[PDB]
Amino acid sequence: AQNPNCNIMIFHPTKEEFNDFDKYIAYMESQGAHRAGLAKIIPPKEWKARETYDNISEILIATPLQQVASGRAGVFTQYHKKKKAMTVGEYRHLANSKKYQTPPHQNFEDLERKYWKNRIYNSPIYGADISGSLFDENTKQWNLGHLGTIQDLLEKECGVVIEGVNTPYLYFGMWKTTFAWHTEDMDLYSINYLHLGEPKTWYVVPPEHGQRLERLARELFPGSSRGCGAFLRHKVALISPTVLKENGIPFNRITQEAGEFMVTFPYGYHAGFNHGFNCAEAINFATPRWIDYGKMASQCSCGEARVTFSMDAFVRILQPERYDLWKRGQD
Ligand SMILES: c1ccc(-c2c[nH]cn2)cc1
Ligand SMILES: O=C(O)CNC(=O)C(=O)O
Ligand code: NI
Ligand SMILES: [Zn+2]
């Protein structure tokens, strides 16, 4: 078995290897990359996403989200308070202000220590889930707006044609902006490109140990667990690496820098935070190996999760028994 310790692997494809996206994902898995739940891919030196990022300031963040924490430093939830719209130029200025800017720090480890010590005492503002893309239309390789769709994958694998579409999302972050412990909708893959700015630190639990994280989460957020059998779908719970270690949960960590791709694999729980002003682009995708994970995916039906139009068909076809109860939670 490849990668039995479930380490995060880092790949350096050549420009030739960077042509066929599906083939390279399959290659990474042949080397055991999926066992970690997360992989880093450093693009060929010849590749670029677009020419420059000099003209992005007029992009609108229609609904910036203030991430307000409750709990303890290492075990907390966050809720999202909607703020007034602002442009990316305005957001960047806010990120760099004295109130929100990254503090002085020695290295990534120092900054990580500061994050977990102090995160709950601040409420950073995130521009999340903004439909759009910053890939140049002429970028032919690993263009996240030109990937094969999940709907076509399901059709190729299972022979059923379904409605729905699959487009990328932009994320504008600042110091301490946080993504809660989660797997993707329908336990899909995700791919994330850090276009510009300061790093993003990731934590990940191997897919084969996901239920260990779930059990700890139920213990640490007992009211939430009573309210919903899949409350991590709400994407509001944070658990620090110190608390994971104290409870024997297997996990890994890695920091993503500008110009690098991360791939998360089916049922790989992940969480993390941004170091300072940045912009990432991400999208879900599928492979033939995903189908059985999709069938298995645990669903929120309490109504909190509330997801896209396109997930309907996934639940309808892969989880017909669950479909009635789940759809009630969306409508
Ligand atoms: C195979 C077996 C179990 C799973 C699973 C368990 N819980 C969520 N997903 C996924 C794939
Ligand atoms: O970058 C973020 O804020 C969160 N990203 C993801 O969870 C992802 O790409 O799967
Ligand atoms: Ni994710
Ligand atoms: Zn729920």
Cα 192 to Cα 125: distance, rounded to the nearest angstrom: 20
Which pair of structure tokens corresponds to residue 168?
């990328």
Tell me the H-state helices in the chain: 21-30, 88-95, 108-118, 150-158, 210-220, 222-227, 241-246, 290-296, 311-318, 320-330
**What Cα–Cα distance (Å) separates residue 201 from each residue in 50, 136, 211, 252, 257?**
24, 26, 23, 11, 9
Angle between helices 311-318 and 150-158 (to 10 degrees): 20
Residue 102 DSSP one-character state: P
Would you state the torsion angle of the CA atoms of residues 230, 234, 236, 240, taken in this order, to the nearest 10 degrees?
Answer: 30
Residue in this structure with the two tokens 């521009």, named with its chain if needed: 127
Is 175:100 a contact under the CB 8 Å cutoff? yes
Is 301:329 a contact under the CB 8 Å cutoff? yes
319 lines ligand 1 (CB under 6 A): no
Tell me the H-state helices in 48-193: 88-95, 108-118, 150-158
Residue 120 DSSP one-character state: G
Cα 158 to Cα 146: distance, rounded to the nearest angstrom: 22
Is 178:116 a contact under the CB 8 Å cutoff? no
278-297 b/e (C-beta count within 10 Å ≥ 16 → b) = bbbbbbbbbbeebbebbeeb
Is 165:270 a contact under the CB 8 Å cutoff? no
Concatenating the DSSP letter of every residue in 17-45 gives TTS-HHHHHHHHHHTTGGGGSEEEEPPPT
Centroid of ligand 1 to alpha carbon of 185 (angstroms) = 13
Ligand 2 atom closest to residue 177's alpha carbon, by position in its atom list:
3
CA 303 from chain centre, in angstroms, equals 21
Residue 174 DSSP one-character state: -
Looking at domain 1-331, its CATH architecture is Sandwich (2.60)
Instruction: Kindly identify the ligand whose nearest atom is closest to the C-alpha of 329.
Output: 4
298 lines ligand 1 (CB under 6 A): yes
Bridge partners (DSSP) listed for residue 252 = 204
Among 190, 273, 283, say which to mutate for ligand 2: greatest number of ligand atoms within 8 Å of CB.
190
285 lines ligand 1 (CB under 6 A): no
Is 170:59 a contact under the CB 8 Å cutoff? yes
Give every CB contact of residue 33 below 8 A, 6+ residues apart in sequence. Answer: 3, 9, 11, 39, 263, 265
Residue 103 DSSP one-character state: P
Residue 186 — left, alpha, or beta (φ > 0 → left; ψ -120 to 50 → alpha)? left
Cα 318 to Cα 54: distance, rounded to the nearest angstrom: 44
Cα 165 to Cα 131: distance, rounded to the nearest angstrom: 12
The 3-state DSSP class for residue 104 equals coil
Bridge partners (DSSP) listed for residue 80 = 67
Residue type, 188: L
Centroid of ligand 2 to alpha carbon of 159 (angstroms) = 30
Torsion sign over Cα 145, 125, 110, 34: negative
Burial of residue 146 (CB within 10 Å: 0-12, 13-18, 19+) is middle
Residue 5 φ then ψ, to 5°? -80, -5
Cα 141 to Cα 143: distance, rounded to the nearest angstrom: 5
End-to-end CA distance of the chain: 44
Centroid of ligand 3 to alpha carbon of 179 (angstroms) = 8
Which pair of structure tokens corresponds to residue 103?
């503090």
Resolution at which this structure was determined, Å: 1.4
Residue 226 φ then ψ, to 5°? -65, -30
Nearest to 268 by CA among 154, 176, 191, 320: 191
Which pair of structure tokens corresponds to residue 172?
């504008």
Bridge partners (DSSP) listed for residue 66 = 81, 125
